[PDB]
RNA sequence: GCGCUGCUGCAGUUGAAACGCCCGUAGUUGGCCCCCCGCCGCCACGAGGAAACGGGAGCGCUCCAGGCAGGCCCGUUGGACCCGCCGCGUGGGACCGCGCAGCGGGCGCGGCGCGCCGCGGCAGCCCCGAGGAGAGCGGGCGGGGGCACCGGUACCGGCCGGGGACGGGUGAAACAGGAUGAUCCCGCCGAGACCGCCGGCCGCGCAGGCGCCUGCCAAGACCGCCUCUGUCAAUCAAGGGCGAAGGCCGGGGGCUAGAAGGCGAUCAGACACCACCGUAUUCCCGGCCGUAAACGGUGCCGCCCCGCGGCCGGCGCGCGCGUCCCGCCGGCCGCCCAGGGAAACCGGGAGGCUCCGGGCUCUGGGGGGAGUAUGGCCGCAAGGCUGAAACUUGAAGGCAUUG
């Protein structure tokens, strides 16, 4: 038929699948290697960096808001990223030139929501979880 | 007409179910053998021989009288051509094409036809080189085809 | 999608056909796609045919005709009402 | 070119039975076709048939009586192990109670039930139900 | 009313010789008297024992004769 | 999850996707037939080779995850057995593929060879001839190809004569022409293109494409056949050849039209559409380029299949003999019952398929970035073949309904 089907045709089928399975975006992104060399976290759950600028970013057209984020530089790479601290009033707990831990959003490496070109989240600052600081479980009187 | 074309007719011949001779047959198996002998001496190809036998002598099939085919009889009598007939005719046609072309070389359809004919010749020659009907050294060359035609004819 | 099974032309058992020029705009058209009509008309309009025949000196003279073939393109046929835009079911009717 | 004579025969049979015909003619005859038809006849799907000799490409005539719902071939002959028949039965047959699967073995052409009885395996030819 | 195993001999004559239940010739032999057997579809020239010329007119299908022969 | 990587089991007319066409090697696939012998695959059984893990027989660590224990009056108390194999042995021998080179007896030693002997013992030694292919004879068929030759008006230019004021062109006008006689009528001369009405649900060709007379050369499919051979076959990376128009190199030719350019109008503007002039080009020879909505947007080979009808080529039957009607093969088309499909629609399949396996080749996997960058090959060049990533985005698309 369209596909070869003879009893001595295993080699051709193997080669066909080998060539054709590179056309899937997911399979390429996983098994090609470019993404790993381009991802600032090099396949890690989260990274540690230093905040250097506190900035606010406007939202997209159908929304109207200014989201609070900070600029970070990763210790182990020295490159630059933008990480966004979501919880209300949690910008005031983050201070310039502070040690932070930055993780990802739900999606692997795409932008999430109406925030344009942002792919990282702040979770720990100065060794204390932001979620815990927001609930008043602990206090940052060491800084 | 399928190998080198797109047509597909079905003009053929359908021989009878029974293999026996005609009730009005008046020829012993030998008498035809002499007729084949003298016809072959006149350089007659087997196909024409069968045509002549069927039309002039009223013999529908030679095998039904003698039990054997014409070329086998000729080989037993040592008269069969070294080069088989179909191949020889293909080579004739190729030579004719080449001559007409060297007269005038602006005709492209003729070159197309020549390509087809030479491909067919190569295939048939390979098959005959296998089956040990031709010498292993036999090879067809465009520039010496007329010579082989003359000697092998 | 596809509107006509003939693709708007009468082309069977061939690859290419010779071209013609529209008689109105002089556009180049394939011969199988151009709209053709044949007409037969009198050289003299019928209003004055009787007058001409009366003035004629010869006996039994017959008014000559004009035999011409008109060929038009698709745009010009529609603009000049040579053909009409029809309904989906009436596109299949082929009788005049 | 022609390759699988059995596939053509079975397709013709199903086509004829679809429109409630009574007889069919399949052009090329073969031993495998004959055994397939004999098994079908013993199971009660196609009644009688006749083989017509012409020296070349013997023809066959078969008489139909409804009953048959589907027939087919598996082109590349896979080698079923004796204990691997249940998976093919489940995949191919509507139920585990009335379909038949044909195999060719060193003991001859038989059904999957018979091969299970003798605890042997072989190669697959086709199926009908 | 109809059985494929025993076709009517006449409806078989109207079918193609290869699609018949048994493939067979459409040709035959016949006598000629100017007293010899001649093929129906003769293509090559034929002569009599006496006739000094030909008695065959090859055509696309069945051969024609000179009418003098019966 | 995902039948969104599809062996089981996707898709390829229109949504993404059938190379422009042909030849062709590797590769893959190959009709039917011999009753038993040998070989390969195949199936079954077996030997041999660590456990742990996994499966699994028995046992109340109080249950359990576990462990191999344990009971008295214990199989010899128990820890049984299976599971890491492309190799080895026995059997079967349906299916799948290969087997060209006489035999038997006597000399002849126990056997096997090399040899010598009766042919005096043998039926001594060829399936058939695929609605597979190729070759052959006969018959007509056709805008199929190449070479030379040749006719006809018409556009353009020139000339003899006539006559006397506008003519051309447009929606309407204005640039170019005219007393140096224009436009118009007739006659002759020159050159180069072109092939009309017939001309078509006609036809030919592998496709691109094919239309004056005459003559020459080679070729091709189809039909008809109790002519020949005997599997010679199908499809295809690599490789080879052909390939509209435009374009390029080198030579010829110069009439029409006409990119570029120029000029008059229109418009707010108009460097565009309309009018006029006009170079390359359009024509021939030799050679490059190798692309098109190169479309039936449907790959090639093969089987079955409702009914009605038209046209072309060839053959046969019948009669009341008409270029009548009844058939067969091949080709080009129309409508259509089933069936199929998201539907439009197809139905000479886009059917016989989730009831999902005839054979071979190619392509596709959300939209952009992008047929781009960087390399390589080809090409005089223009450019062709091959061909990413980062980054970005939530829809883009198809067929159909109402407004
Ligand atoms: Mg081929
Ligand atoms: Mg055929
Ligand atoms: Mg539209
Ligand atoms: Mg075209
Ligand atoms: Mg898909
Ligand atoms: Mg589109
Ligand atoms: Mg598409
Ligand atoms: Mg050109
Ligand atoms: Mg295409
Ligand atoms: Mg499928
Ligand atoms: Mg994509
Ligand atoms: Zn017009």
UniProtKB/TrEMBL annotation, chain A:
Keywords on record: Ribonucleoprotein, Ribosomal protein
Ranges in coiled-coil conformation: none
UniProt keyword Ribonucleoprotein present: yes
Gene Ontology CC, one term: small ribosomal subunit
Tree of life domain: Eukaryota
GO biological process: translation
Keyword Isomerase (UniProt): no
Pfam family, one: Ribosom_S12_S23
Gene Ontology MF terms in the entry: structural constituent of ribosome
Family statement drawn from the similarity comment of this UniProt entry: Belongs to the universal ribosomal protein uS12 family.
UniProt protein name: SSU ribosomal protein S12P
Organism listed in the record: Giardia intestinalis
Higher taxonomy: Eukaryota, Metamonada, Diplomonadida, Hexamitidae, Giardiinae
Automatic annotation (TrEMBL), chain B:
Gene Ontology, cellular component aspect: cytosolic small ribosomal subunit; nucleolus
Ranges in a coiled coil: none
Pfam families to which the protein is assigned, alphabetical: Ribosomal_S13_N, Ribosomal_S15
Gene Ontology molecular function terms on file: small ribosomal subunit rRNA binding; structural constituent of ribosome
Superkingdom of origin organism: Eukaryota
Residues holding Mg(2+): 7
Oxidoreductase listed as a keyword: no
Record GO biological process: translation
Keywords for this protein: Metal-binding, Ribonucleoprotein, Ribosomal protein
InterPro entries from the UniProt entry: Ribosomal_uS15, Ribosomal_uS15_arc_euk, Ribosomal_uS15_N, uS15_NS1_RNA-bd_sf
Keyword DNA-binding (UniProt): no
UniProt similarity note: Belongs to the universal ribosomal protein uS15 family.
UniProt cross-references to NCBIfam families, sorted A to Z: PRK08561.1
Record's protein name: Ribosomal protein S13
TrEMBL record, chain C:
Keywords (A to Z) from UniProt: Metal-binding, Ribonucleoprotein, Ribosomal protein, Zinc
Pfam families, A to Z: Ribosomal_S26e
Biological process per Gene Ontology, one example term: translation
Residues engaged in binding Zn(2+) 2: 22, 24
Cysteine disulfide links: 22-25, 22-76, 25-73, 25-76, 73-76
Gene3D superfamilies linked: Ribosomal protein S26e (3.30.1740.20)
Name listed for the protein in its UniProt record: 40S ribosomal protein S26
Automatic annotation (TrEMBL), chain D:
Organism lineage: Eukaryota, Metamonada, Diplomonadida, Hexamitidae, Giardiinae
Protein name per the record: SSU ribosomal protein S8P
Recorded GO MF terms: structural constituent of ribosome
GO CC annotation terms, alphabetical: ribonucleoprotein complex; ribosome
Top-rank lineage group of the source organism: Eukaryota
Source species: Giardia intestinalis
Gene3D superfamilies: 3.30.1370.30, 3.30.1490.10
GO BP, sorted A to Z: translation
Keyword Ribosomal protein set for record: yes
Keyword tags: Ribonucleoprotein, Ribosomal protein
Family: Belongs to the universal ribosomal protein uS8 family.
């Amino acid at each position: 038929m369209s596909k070869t089907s003879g009893l001595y045709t295993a080699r051709k089928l193997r080669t066909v699948r080998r060539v054709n399975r590179w056309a899937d975006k997911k399979y390429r992104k996983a098994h090609l290697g470019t993404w790993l060399k381009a991802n600032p976290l090099e396949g890690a759950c989260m990274a540690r960096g230093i905040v250097t600028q506190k900035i606010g970013i406007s939202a997209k057209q159908p929304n109207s808001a200014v989201r609070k984020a900070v600029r970070v530089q990763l210790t182990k790479n020295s490159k630059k990223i933008t990480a966004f601290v979501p919880r209300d009033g949690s910008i005031t707990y983050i201070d310039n030139n502070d040690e932070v831990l930055v993780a990802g959003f739900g999606r692997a490496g795409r932008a999430v929501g109406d925030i344009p070109g942002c792919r990282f989240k702040v979770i720990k600052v100065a060794g204390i979880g932001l979620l815990a600081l927001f609930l008043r479980k602990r206090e940052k009187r060491a800084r | 007409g399928r190998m080198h074309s797109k047509g597909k007719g079905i003009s053929r011949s359908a021989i009878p179910y029974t293999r026996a001779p005609a009730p009005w047959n008046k020829y012993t198996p030998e008498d035809v053998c002499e007729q084949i002998c003298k016809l072959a001496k006149k350089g007659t190809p087997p196909s024409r021989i069968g045509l002549i036998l069927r039309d002039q002598f009223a013999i529908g099939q030679v095998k039904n009288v003698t039990g054997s085919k014409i070329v086998r009889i000729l080989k037993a009598k040592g008269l069969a051509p070294e080069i088989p007939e179909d191949l020889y005719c293909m080579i004739k046609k190729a030579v004719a094409i080449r001559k007409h072309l060297e007269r005038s070389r602006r005709d492209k359809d003729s070159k197309f036809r020549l390509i087809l004919v030479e491909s067919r010749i190569h295939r048939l020659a390979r098959y005959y080189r296998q089956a040990r009907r031709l010498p292993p050294t036999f090879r067809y060359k465009s520039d010496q085809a007329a010579a082989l035609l003359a000697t092998y004819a | 999608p596809v509107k006509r099974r003939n693709n708007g032309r009468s082309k069977y058992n061939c690859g290419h056909t010779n071209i013609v020029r529209c008689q109105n705009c002089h556009r180049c058209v394939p011969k199988d796609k151009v709209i053709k009509r044949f007409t037969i008309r009198n050289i003299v309009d019928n209003t004055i045919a009787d007058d001409v025949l009366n003035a004629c000196v010869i006996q039994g003279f017959a008014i000559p005709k004009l035999y011409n073939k008109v060929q038009y393109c698709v745009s010009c046929s529609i603009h000049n009402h040579i053909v009409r835009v029809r309904s989906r079911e009436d596109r299949k009717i082929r009788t005049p | 070119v022609r390759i699988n004579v059995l596939r053509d025969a079975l397709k013709s049979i199903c086509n004829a039975q679809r429109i409630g015909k009574k007889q069919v003619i399949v052009r090329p005859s073969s031993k495998v076709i004959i055994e397939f038809l004999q098994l079908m006849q013993k199971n009660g799907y196609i009644s009688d048939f006749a083989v017509v000799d012409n020296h070349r490409s013997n023809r066959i005539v078969v008489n139909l009586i409804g009953r048959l719902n589907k027939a087919g071939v598996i082109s590349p002959r896979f080698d079923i192990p004796a204990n691997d028949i249940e998976k093919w039965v489940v995949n191919l047959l509507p139920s585990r109670l009335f379909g038949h699967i044909i195999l060719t073995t060193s003991q001859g052409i038989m059904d999957h039930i018979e091969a299970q009885h003798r605890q042997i395996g072989g190669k697959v030819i086709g199926y009908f139900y | 009313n109809v059985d494929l195993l025993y076709p009517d001999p006449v409806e078989e004559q109207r079918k193609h010789k290869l699609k018949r239940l048994v493939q067979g010739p459409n040709s035959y032999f016949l006598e000629i008297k100017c007293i010899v057997v001649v093929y129906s579809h003769a293509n090559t020239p034929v002569f009599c024992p006496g006739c000094t010329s030909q008695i065959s007119i090859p055509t696309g299908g069945k051969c024609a004769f000179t009418s003098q022969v019966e």
